[PDB]
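Input record (Table S2, row 421):
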Amino acid sequence: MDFYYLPGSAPCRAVQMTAAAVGVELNLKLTNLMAGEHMKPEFLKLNPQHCIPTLVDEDGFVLWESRAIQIYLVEKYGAHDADLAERLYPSDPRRRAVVHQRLFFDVAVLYQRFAEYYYPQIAGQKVPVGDPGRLRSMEQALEFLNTFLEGEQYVAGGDDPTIADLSILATIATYEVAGYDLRRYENVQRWYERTSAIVPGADKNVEGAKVFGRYFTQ
Amino acid sequence: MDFYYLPGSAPCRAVQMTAAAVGVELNLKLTNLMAGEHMKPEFLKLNPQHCIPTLVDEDGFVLWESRAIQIYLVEKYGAHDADLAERLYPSDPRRRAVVHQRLFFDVAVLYQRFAEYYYGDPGRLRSMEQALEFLNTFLEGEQYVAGGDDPTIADLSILATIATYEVAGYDLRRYENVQRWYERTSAIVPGADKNVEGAKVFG
Ligand SMILES: CCCCCCSC[C@H](NC(=O)CC[C@H]([NH3+])C(=O)O)C(=O)NCC(=O)O
Ligand SMILES: CCCCCCSC[C@H](NC(=O)CC[C@H]([NH3+])C(=O)O)C(=O)NCC(=O)O
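Output record (S-hexylglutathione complex):
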């Protein structure tokens, strides 16, 4: 299964952790966005949205959006080990719904506000300062996460990490390398250390996040 | 089941079409954001993220994010009509993955870039038009946004978003597949008339 990616990319790292959890080996295909490798006609024919991660499965089925890939990996490549799939992606509609809400929270709030705050600083114009409104908004996202984690081990509840933990762990590791002091959010920091110590593929998350630190050397 | 909403709100409209599709009646709880009703302690106790739509089911289960609500409605209520549930939310992992990708596309790209442009910047406009072009491309040779022979919850979500584009004054006929899908899907999806009317009257 071909996996078009960059290690620095949070959503790519979420997929790497999930593939590790379900015992899927990914054929890693570095996709240099700066070089426009995602804009090559062969890539566009696979994925007209020209984005990473992109997964191409054994039949040539092409999928993108990291969290859609996470669910697909569990349902198709994990579900044989029923207990494992249930831990990663509980099927009770209430439990499933909380996992989904946290995944959407990660894409549209937690990672979205990270991008809105930092991307203008580290790319394009490279604005020399962060917008204070964008900072407050981002801090509000961290505050939401901190609240979700109050009296809970994991982001969507459960006795074990779910795919929501894996997605948010990719995101939070990116906050860390950006230089955000997560110790401001005690539950987030506690969860971050614990989940980093136990999840499959945490090595890919840690090393890839360090790579993304290349945007933050100044 | 209690539905905390505003009539003009896209994600609210998406949930309303989905409830209609599964034959669920919603107890409407108008939640005025400009009036700060989402920041009242009663609401914050239900939903610390203080956002609408929020659903409270009979058993006291609280849920937010429209697209999570959509899935919940199908899984819990749609499942009483097996063929219906499979039309709205196909179970095959590949088919479901496309539905999921389209739902995430809607929140993070299509609606996101709409919000960035309308809530006029040349760069923000370009980014928004790129999202419309993506949807236009997805719809080349497909009746529905995630494929399939019938509308899925991804169609319903994107219908709510696209109705907001229309009322904001964007010329959707620039994206032929988008306009074609929008007019046709609006004609056949139960409650989709109310979607456009709600967008037009309150958006
Ligand atoms: C500013 C520093 C660099 C940040 C890199 C961000 S990750 C690369 C980016 N991918 C995404 O943002 C995918 C997000 C998507 N929501 C997911 O989870 O898969 C991309 O392919 N972008 C190219 C494109 O979409 O055209
Ligand atoms: C005239 C209607 C136009 C304005 C409607 C905007 S939708 C209201 C907004 N809700 C959301 O953006 C929820 C988005 C979420 N992605 C979903 O799909 O449910 C909100 O509760 N915002 C308040 C908050 O989050 O604090």
